[PDB]
Every structure is written in C-alpha cells, then in structure tokens.
Design a protein around this ligand. Structure first.
Ligand SMILES: Nc1ncnc2c1ncn2[C@@H]1O[C@H](COP(=O)(O)OP(=O)(O)NP(=O)(O)O)[C@@H](O)[C@H]1O
Ligand SMILES: Cc1cc2nc3c(=O)[nH]c(=O)nc-3n(C[C@H](O)[C@H](O)[C@H](O)CO)c2cc1C
Ligand SMILES: [Mg+2]
Length: 318
C-alpha cells in the first residue's frame, strides 16, 4: 500500500554505526528492501557486505574499506547481488554522517539500482549530482540533530528519509532549464497530501508552465515540501475543516513566486516562524538562503500565508 509507494523511489539509503564491531547497519529504507530483496528486520545488525559476491571487484571494495578507515566520502559503481541471487550494478555514494557530537561515528551510503549489464551519458552526471544533493542535504539535517542510541531509532531516521522526498521525485522527472516546475510541484503536493493528509483537506495547485534548472528545482521542491507539510500538520489542530493552496507564478525579471496558503488555525503570535521553530524551520531558512530567495509570512485566525520569492534569472550567476 505504502510499501510499494515509498519503495518505487530510486534512492536507497542506509546508515551504519562504524564504531560498533564489524560496522553493522542500523537503518535501511524501503528502497533498500525492494532493491536487495532483504527485509529491514533481516539486515539491521549486519555489515552491508552481504550484497557482494563473485563478480564484485576487489579494487572497489578496498577503496570502500579505505574510505571508511579514513573517514572519507567515496563513490563507486559496484556489482552487487539481491537476496534471490540476481546480480546488478549498484552506484554507491557514501561517507561519514556527521552528528552533533562526533564527525565520523556514523556512515551513510546511498544506492541507485542501475540495472544489469555484462559507461556515462549526460543524464548520468545529472542523476549523480542528485545523489550528491541527497547526501549533502541529509548531512546538513543530521549535523543539526543528535543521533540517538530500535524502533525509536528508526523514527529518527524515518524522518530524515522523508525530507529527501522532493529529491527522489526529482530523480524520476529527470529520468524522463530542463525541469518542468509546475508538473514537478503537482507531484510534490500529491505525495505530501498522500502522506500527510486525508479527506476533509483540499489541496489546490496552480503552477505556470516554466522550465528551470535541476539545482533550482531540487531546492524549491524541498522548500515547498517543508512548508506544505507544515500546513497539513499544524493549521487545523483545533479546526474541523480546511483548505491548502500551492501556487507557482512566474513574474517579471524571471522572478518566481511560490506561495502556500492556509485558512486554518494560524501560526501562534509568540512563534516567529521560520526564525523560531523546530528542525523544519531551520531547513527552510537554509534552502531559502541557497536559493537567494526571500520568505514572508502573514498571521491570524484568517489563516497563514507563506510567500517565497525566487530569482530564476540570477541562478546562472549564483
Ligand atoms: N501552518 C501552520 N499553522 C499553525 N502553526 C504552524 C504552521 N506551520 C508552523 N506552525 C508552528 O510553527 C512551529 C514550527 O514548525 P517547524 O519548524 O516546521 O517544525 P514542525 O512542523 O513542528 N515539525 P518539523 O518541521 O518536521 O521539524 C510548529 O510547531 C507550529 O507551532
Ligand atoms: C553505510 C554503508 C553502506 C554500504 N553499502 C554497500 C553496498 O550497498 N554495496 C556494497 O557492495 N558495499 C557496501 N558497503 C561496503 C561494505 O559494507 C564494507 O564496509 C566494505 O565492503 C568493506 O569490506 C557499505 C558500507 C557502509 C558503511
Ligand atoms: Mg515543520
């Protein structure tokens, strides 16, 4: 139901505790289960090297081993084997996760199933850039938080996994100024509402047709994800009904305005979001800064209006 939904995603993510004997996996996501044929229950507590076998290149393995020992980032395309014995090429990107405390205790790796073959396009590099965006975005999130130390541990990592959602959706659009933002936002809103909402919540989407670069899209997607999620989660706490609206309008000078509007409960007056808040508010401010954008908010029992102004003209310069 959600297993298949969450699983169809192209990124696969794992986290290992390299401080523990034999560097056991402590977390894997649904994509990993689908890709490898192993259940999460089966895999946690074991070193990920069970995916390797006959055709696995020792050179690549050594480089992974060296990277872990040197607390370094590494990227290899490696031959791996699923639970049913099926071989596949795995494009692996990994390196130290960086806690609040230690900078090298935990490692994260991402896996992209590249199918079978027994090469580099121009799509390949665009795809690879995304896997860096994923890892990179994950790192910023992690460094703010404090990795706790089974199910509750998984919830700390289920949340992380959830935010990379804009980027997994982006990879899919990419597989098919090159990103159709309106189309992309439509899939973002649907996914979010699918996860974070239900029945009595109406989600409207009004996007102009415009193509933008990948980096801009990935950034925008994550920005909108945070803010749109906030709407469905918070705006109707004490409310029986509501409406959320996402807009994306191209204005003059290639200035793009992205809006998220509630009619719900309103942001508390003491709280000056996103300057004040939880991890989300911090995420939003970073993404806003990387975009060179401006965010504004208007409060009250008539609802919450969020507006992000993004300069598509200055992206080249940036
Ligand atoms: N649409 C909204 N309506 C009412 N209150 C809101 C709304 N959006 C945010 N808030 C308030 O702002 C606070 C900060 O939210 P935020 O920083 O995004 O973290 P969070 O939504 O609580 N969970 P997370 O964002 O995933 O870390 C929330 O706890 C709410 O009290
Ligand atoms: C987080 C993490 C994920 C890994 N994922 C893979 C993988 O998907 N495929 C693989 O062949 N090796 C993987 N390795 C390498 C493997 O587990 C082991 O550390 C090295 O092969 C050293 O023997 C991973 C290592 C870490 C730390
Ligand atoms: Mg939030």
């Amino acid at each position: 139901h959600d297993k298949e939904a969450w699983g169809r995603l192209p990124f696969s993510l794992t986290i290992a505790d390299i401080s523990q004997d034999d560097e056991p996996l402590i977390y894997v996501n649904r994509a990993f289960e689908q890709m490898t044929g192993y259940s999460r229950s089966s895999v946690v507590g074991r070193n990920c090297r069970f995916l390797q076998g006959e055709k696995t290149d020792p050179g690549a393995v050594e480089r992974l081993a060296k990277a872990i020992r040197n607390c370094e980032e590494v990227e290899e395309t490696i031959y791996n084997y699923r639970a049913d014995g099926e071989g596949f090429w795995n494009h692996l990107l990994m390196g130290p996760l960086e806690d609040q405390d230690e900078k090298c205790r935990y490692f994260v790796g991402i896996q992209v199933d590249m199918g079978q073959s027994e090469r580099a396009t121009e799509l390949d590099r665009q795809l690879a850039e995304v896997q860096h965006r994923v890892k990179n975005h994950l790192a910023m999130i992690v460094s703010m938080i404090r990795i706790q130390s089974a199910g509750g541990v998984g919830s700390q990592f289920d949340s992380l996994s959830r935010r990379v959602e804009a980027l997994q959706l982006l990879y899919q659009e990419m597989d098919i100024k090159i990103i159709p933002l309106g189309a992309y936002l439509g899939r973002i809103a649907s996914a979010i509402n699918h996860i974070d909402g239900r029945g009595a919540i109406k989600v409207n989407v009004q996007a102009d047709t415009v193509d933008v670069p990948v980096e801009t899209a990935g950034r925008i997607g994550l920005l909108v994800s945070e803010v749109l999620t906030n709407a469905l989660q918070h705006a109707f706490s004490d409310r029986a009904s509501g409406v959320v609206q996402l807009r994306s309008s191209v204005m003059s000078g290639e200035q793009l305005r992205v809006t998220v509007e509630d009619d719900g409960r309103g942001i508390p007056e003491d709280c000056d979001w996103p300057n004040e808040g939880n991890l989300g508010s911090r995420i939003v401010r970073q993404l806003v800064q990387g975009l060179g954008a401006e965010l504004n908010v208007t409060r009250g029992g008539t609802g919450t209006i969020v507006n992000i102004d993004i300069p598509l003209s200055q992206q080249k310069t940036l």
